[PDB]
Amino acid sequence: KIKNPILTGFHPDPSICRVGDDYYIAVSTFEWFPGVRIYHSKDLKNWRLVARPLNRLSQLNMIGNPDSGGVWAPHLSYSDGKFWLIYTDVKVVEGQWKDGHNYLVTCDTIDGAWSDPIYLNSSGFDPSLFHDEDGRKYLVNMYWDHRVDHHPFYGIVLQEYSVEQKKLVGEPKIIFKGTDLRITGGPHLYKINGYYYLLTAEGGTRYNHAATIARSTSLYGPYEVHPDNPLLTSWPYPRNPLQKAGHASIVHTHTDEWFLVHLTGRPLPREGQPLLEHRGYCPLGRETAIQRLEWKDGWPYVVGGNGPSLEIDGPSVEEVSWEKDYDEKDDFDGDTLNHHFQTLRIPLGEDIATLKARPGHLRLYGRESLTSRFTQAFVARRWQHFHFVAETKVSFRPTTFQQSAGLVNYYNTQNWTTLQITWHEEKGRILELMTCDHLVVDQPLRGREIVVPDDIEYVYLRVTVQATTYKYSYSFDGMNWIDLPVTFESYKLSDDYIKSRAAFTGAFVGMHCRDGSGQNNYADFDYFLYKEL
């Protein structure tokens, strides 16, 4: 029935929520705006985007945020007639500190106007709100130890949240230090039977990733660990197509069945490479997958063993599939950009991105460069398949080399490639390739750039991705296409390639316009095409 991953491309830290016979997953969005993506399902198999809750500056202001900062794992729950969303804005993602702030927002409906944030704490990321049977609410998060002689993951801290007072109350207490796997985060609490079950993520979000579960009769512990822990992990299964299985949440379905959503990375093909030396590169980033649970001796178990199964049986419900929610060829005739498009860190107002200036086109007024953590005129969507074609059609008249417009495949500010239109002193309006690898820039088509003739209004830019490699191509008529003679490698746009390890997103493809001269020169994009191949 259900093939994994259920959410493909960039979809980490899945937090699942049941409301009656409705099902929701919220995933982390990091530096991409708006914050948080919530998907809905009736059968746990088919999923559609229904909410992007953190869409106001008052809720989320990520200007300047480092790559892989911002919205880390979110927590979605429902209680007392409303949804509760807990989220972090992480400001520091390298070194001894992980400075970041936890906030609560609520809404009556999944896609309404969510509240302005209530500040919770800053002690660590992976905040989760637990609603206990007595009406009392509790926040769990990881507690961060910055000290040099110390492992940073100090364990799971718990504190009561007062809905009345709109603040944490009493004293924070450590309830669980984790197992020897350490890197203990992603805590979620469940009152099942006579027990509080504490689900955590351990071993880090790379190849040693795991989901650990423990249980106690006291909310404050101590928690005895699952006798066959890890509950879930891909570490001992180097040939499993689904790696990095961890950061899970549990769902007890209305049909009295149990499932476990978790993140996973799907490495590119690795034939002829040493199985264990390096375990792979994931351009799709961390995706969402689902597993069935079964119960033995007051403990949950993953069906099929503690590794992730590629395919599982769904709950005992009627299949409810969803109509496609984007046009493969999006001609920009809508009044609002399709919801699979995101922007970097900030919302882009009509002064930067507009569907109104020239009907049927997305107009991007040129802002800062592809290396900027501030204001980029960039509108992008996820890679959601290993095999796809993405394509745009743009009219652009750059009068200086400080101006550019193109199709970009982007991981972060220091890691991207692009086929762009720019201006050159002798050659005039030109097409070039530009790549950035850990801030180091290459122009592989120097000085051999494609001269664009004066009488061409639109340049058509395309990328074809084929798993390990991809290629750019262009047309001046949309019919006769010419490949650019550089073969690019998809692993360079993957989490695993990034030297900082603050690499928690995934590859995007989008439309960019830079104007470094500050003359407000703009690009008109007639369509954006994304098509699985």
Ligand X SMILES: O[C@@H]1[C@@H](O)[C@H](O[C@@H]2CO[C@@H](O)[C@H](O)[C@H]2O)OC[C@H]1O
List residues near a second copy by CB under 8 A.
63-65, 91-92, 94-97, 99, 101-102, 119-123, 144-149, 151, 172, 179-183, 203-204, 208, 235-236, 239, 272-277, 368-369, 371-375, 401-402, 414, 436, 439, 441-443, 446-447, 515-519
Q: Would you state the structure tokens that stand for residue 415, as one six-digit string?
A: 């890691």
- Minimum CB separation of residue 359 from Ca ion in Å reads 8
- Minimum CB separation of residue 94 from ligand X in Å reads 9
**CA-based end-to-end distance of the chain:** 23
Nearest one of 205, 201, 149, 197 to 175, comparing CA atoms: 197
| CA atoms lying within 13 Å on the CB side of residue 252 | 7
Cis peptide before 236 (omega within 30 of 0): no
Q: Which residue's structure tokens are 């002829």?
A: 272
Q: Would you state the structure tokens that stand for residue 356, as one six-digit string?
A: 């109104």
- When the beta carbons of 30 and 474 are compared against ligand X, the nearer one is 30
- When the beta carbons of 160 and 331 are compared against Ca ion, the nearer one is 331
What DSSP character marks residue 94? S
List, in order, residues 6 or more apart from 149 with CB less than 8 Å away: none
Residues in the chain: 533
What are the C-alpha distances in Å from 112 to residues 27, 42, 334, 352, 498? 18, 20, 21, 26, 37
Nearest one of 12, 36, 102, 34 to 344, comparing CA atoms: 34
From residue 348 to residue 367, the character string flagging contacts with Ca ion as x (rule: CB under 5 A) and all else as - is ------------x-------
- Minimum CB separation of residue 332 from Ca ion in Å reads 5
Asked if 13 interacts with ligand X (CB under 6 A), we say yes
Of these, 172, 204, 304, 444, which contacts ligand X (CB under 6 A)? 204
b/e map of 366-391 (b: 16 or more CB within 10 Å)? bbbbbeebeebbbbbbbbbebebbbb
Footprint on residues 104-163 left by ligand X (CB under 6 A): 125-126
- When the beta carbons of 69 and 398 are compared against ligand X, the nearer one is 69
Using CB under 5 A, count the residues that bind Ca ion: 5
CB count in 10 Å sphere of residue 135: 9
CB count in 10 Å sphere of residue 154: 19
Partner in contact with 369, chosen from a second copy, Ca ion, ligand X, none, beta carbon below 5 to 8 Å by kind: a second copy
Spatial distance between the Cα atoms of 140 and 157, rounded to a whole number of angstroms = 6
Q: Which stretch binds ligand X (CB under 6 A): 188-196, 200-208, 392-400, 436-444?
A: 200-208
- When the beta carbons of 277 and 311 are compared against ligand X, the nearer one is 277
- When the beta carbons of 341 and 416 are compared against Ca ion, the nearer one is 341
Of these, 32, 33, 72, 527, which contacts ligand X (CB under 6 A)? 72
Asked if 12 interacts with ligand X (CB under 6 A), we say yes
Positions that interact with Ca ion (CB under 5 A): 331-332, 360, 526-527
- Chain residues in the site for ligand X (CB under 6 A): 12-13, 28, 72-73, 125-126, 183, 185-186, 201, 204-206, 247, 501, 504
